[PDB]
Amino acid sequence: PLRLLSSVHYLTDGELPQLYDYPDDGTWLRANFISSLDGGATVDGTSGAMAGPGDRFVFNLLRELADVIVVGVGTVRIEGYSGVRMGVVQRQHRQARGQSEVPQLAIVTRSGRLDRDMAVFTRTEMAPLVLTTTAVADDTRQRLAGLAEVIACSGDDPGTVDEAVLVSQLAARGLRRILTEGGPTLLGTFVERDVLDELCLTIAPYVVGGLARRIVTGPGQVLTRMRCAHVLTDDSGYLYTRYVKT
Amino acid sequence: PLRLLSSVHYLTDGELPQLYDYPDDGTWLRANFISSLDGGATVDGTSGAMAGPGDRFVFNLLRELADVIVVGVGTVRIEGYSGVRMGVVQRQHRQARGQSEVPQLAIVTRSGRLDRDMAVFTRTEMAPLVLTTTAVADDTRQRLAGLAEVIACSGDDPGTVDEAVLVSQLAARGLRRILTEGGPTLLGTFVERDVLDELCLTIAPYVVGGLARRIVTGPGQVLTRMRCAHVLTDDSGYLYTRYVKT
Numbered sequence: 001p002l003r004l005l006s007s008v009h010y011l012t013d014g015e016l017p018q019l020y021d022y023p024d025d026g027t028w029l030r031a032n033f034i035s036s037l038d039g040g041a042t043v044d045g046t047s048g049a050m051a052g053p054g055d056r057f058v059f060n061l062l063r064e065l066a067d068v069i070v071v072g073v074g075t076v077r078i079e080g081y082s083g084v085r086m087g088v089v090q091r092q093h094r095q096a097r098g099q100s101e102v103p104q105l106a107i108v109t110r111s112g113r114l115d116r117d118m119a120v121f122t123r124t125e126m127a128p129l130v131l132t133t134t135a136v137a138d139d140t141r142q143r144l145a146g147l148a149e150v151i152a153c154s155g156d157d158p159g160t161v162d163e164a165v166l167v168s169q170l171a172a173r174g175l176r177r178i179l180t181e182g183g184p185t186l187l188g189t190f191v192e193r194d195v196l197d198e199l200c201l202t203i204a205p206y207v208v209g210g211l212a213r214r215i216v217t218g219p220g221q222v223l224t225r226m227r228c229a230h231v232l233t234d235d236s237g238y239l240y241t242r243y244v245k246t
Numbered sequence: 247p248l249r250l251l252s253s254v255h256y257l258t259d260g261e262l263p264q265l266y267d268y269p270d271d272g273t274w275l276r277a278n279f280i281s282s283l284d285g286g287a288t289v290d291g292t293s294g295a296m297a298g299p300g301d302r303f304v305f306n307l308l309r310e311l312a313d314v315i316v317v318g319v320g321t322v323r324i325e326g327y328s329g330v331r332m333g334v335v336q337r338q339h340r341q342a343r344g345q346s347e348v349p350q351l352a353i354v355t356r357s358g359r360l361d362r363d364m365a366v367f368t369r370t371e372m373a374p375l376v377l378t379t380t381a382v383a384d385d386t387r388q389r390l391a392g393l394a395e396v397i398a399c400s401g402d403d404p405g406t407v408d409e410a411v412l413v414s415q416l417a418a419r420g421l422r423r424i425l426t427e428g429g430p431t432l433l434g435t436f437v438e439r440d441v442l443d444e445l446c447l448t449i450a451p452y453v454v455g456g457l458a459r460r461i462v463t464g465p466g467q468v469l470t471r472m473r474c475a476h477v478l479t480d481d482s483g484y485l486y487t488r489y490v491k492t
């Protein structure tokens with residue numbers, strides 16, 4: 001029944017993208033998170049502490065592959081989101097694949113209460129998308145004129161975001177290779193709404209104790225089976241897993 | 247940097263214990279938990295739903311190997327703990343290793359408010375240990391006379407349990423191969439107190455959303471590095487990991 005996993009293959013620069021390729025067509029919502037062994041998403045309020053040697057490799061790759069990075073407004077402020085920096089070689093590979101040189105950032109907010117003075121609009125090569133509700137879209141649009149394209153992502157209720165709508169709105173703009181890196185609330189809603197296609201999860205070899213929240217938070221409770229596509233490791237005992245929805 | 251993990255070896259009946267052996271001497275506190283990809287310890291309030299094909303294999307093995315199973319009084323009630331059932335072959339292998347035929351159960355409680363009428367004392371081959379505080383030990387001892395050996399596990403504060411003391415009290419009684427299966431509060435305190443030597447964690451290939459709590463709960467925040475001793479898998483995409491403290 002049980003099989004021992006072992007390192008059978010060293011990954012170099014180029015086999016790595018293959019492992020994390022998006023499907024050749026269709027919208028694909030990929031999440032990339034890190035957590036402790038005991039499910040803590042945070043250490044001292046952020047994720048960067050737990051980050052593996054591999055983790056920044058993988059984190060960067062997934063960004064390189066994404067058409068858009070979708071992020072909750074909470075993570076933007078907390079993780080200090082600025083523009084998606086692509087290095088010269090990253091830009092090259094993106095252009096080679098026919099994508100823009102830098103992935104778009106898309107910020108999800110139900111409230112739309114994004115300060116014009118927010119950090120996220122400032123140090124960036126590209127104006128973010130703001131994914132919000134039909135209700136607040138117009139005001140948000142005017143308030144953020146010149147700083148962000150504001151997109152209504154309501155489905156039926158104009159006062160909330162419909163996550164499948166959100167996904168289709170991004171697809172609608174050719175941003176079908178979607179990466180989300182947080183936060184837990186956002187991820188929680190993707191999970192609740194069953195629109196998460198893939199979870200790339202770094203499991204950091206730490207226990208952090210009970211204080212930390214999980215990589216998903218919120219009222220959602222589901223039981224979505226996923227298929228383990230791969231587990232990578234490094235010498236530091238990290239697991240870089242990639243699971244795709246059944 | 248990254249290595250692809252793959253199934254290199256089929257585990258049979260007998261190589262499995264080797265992977266999960268306790269050190270030949272010394273006290274060893276091993277936890278065995280299961281969680282979802284997104285760190286949920288529970289589904290609908292229990293853990294059994296997520297359980298792999300492998301998971302009951304491993305769960306049983308770890309029990310077979312343990313001198314004592316330490317459990318919070320919460321898990322006892324919630325998971326419906328009765329006596330540790332060992333099958334005839336399990337008993338045999340335990341005797342072969344010089345252990346009692348059935349592992350002892352040890353219930354941790356600060357309050358000591360264990361009903362004499364509790365389920366845990368009833369359907370069992372062996373009287374449980376009750377690990378509690380110096381303060382309530384005497385009353386708990388009298389109240390549970392005939393049903394459980396009550397052991398004070400205070401260190402300095404007689405009103406709380408000192409987890410290192412708890413471990414030594416079990417060692418003191420020859421129960422040095424310790425398995426805990428919960429709950430999160432208990433595990434949280436083992437983690438807080440840095441007495442957890444090993445975490446065997448089943449990662450079930452599900453996301454469950456934000457409602458679930460983690461396999462550790464409580465106020466504790468630590469950053470304890472662990473070494474990945476092994477990752478096993480099955481066809482169902484479960485990971486049966488074993489991490490030992492650095």
Ligand SMILES: NC(=O)c1ccc[n+]([C@@H]2O[C@H](COP(=O)([O-])OP(=O)(O)OC[C@H]3O[C@@H](n4cnc5c(N)ncnc54)[C@H](OP(=O)(O)O)[C@@H]3O)[C@@H](O)[C@H]2O)c1
Nearest residue numbers: 033034041047072073074075109110111182183185186189
């Ligand atoms: N371990 C990891 O991998 C990881 C990764 C990322 C973040 N984190 C951590 O998690 C924490 C942040 O948590 P968080 O839950 O507040 O982050 P968040 O999900 O990014 O932010 C929450 C806010 O974003 C908006 N939002 C999220 N989902 C939405 C939805 N479905 N529809 C409309 N708006 C939505 C809402 O904004 P409005 O209030 O404006 O409506 C919501 O209040 C930080 O500590 C961060 O470091 C950890």
Ligand SMILES: NC(=O)c1ccc[n+]([C@@H]2O[C@H](COP(=O)([O-])OP(=O)(O)OC[C@H]3O[C@@H](n4cnc5c(N)ncnc54)[C@H](OP(=O)(O)O)[C@@H]3O)[C@@H](O)[C@H]2O)c1
Nearest residue numbers: 279280287293318319320321355356357428429431432435
């Ligand atoms: N996914 C998994 O692998 C897994 C495994 C096990 C359990 N669970 C789940 O977790 C839930 C139970 O959570 P829980 O935190 O209440 O379980 P718990 O830790 O077993 O029970 C908590 C209680 O046990 C006692 N306790 C725990 N740690 C103690 C300590 N260091 N010192 C003194 N007493 C201590 C206290 O009893 P007193 O109040 O009497 O002082 C405490 O209130 C259930 O839903 C269960 O299914 C999940």
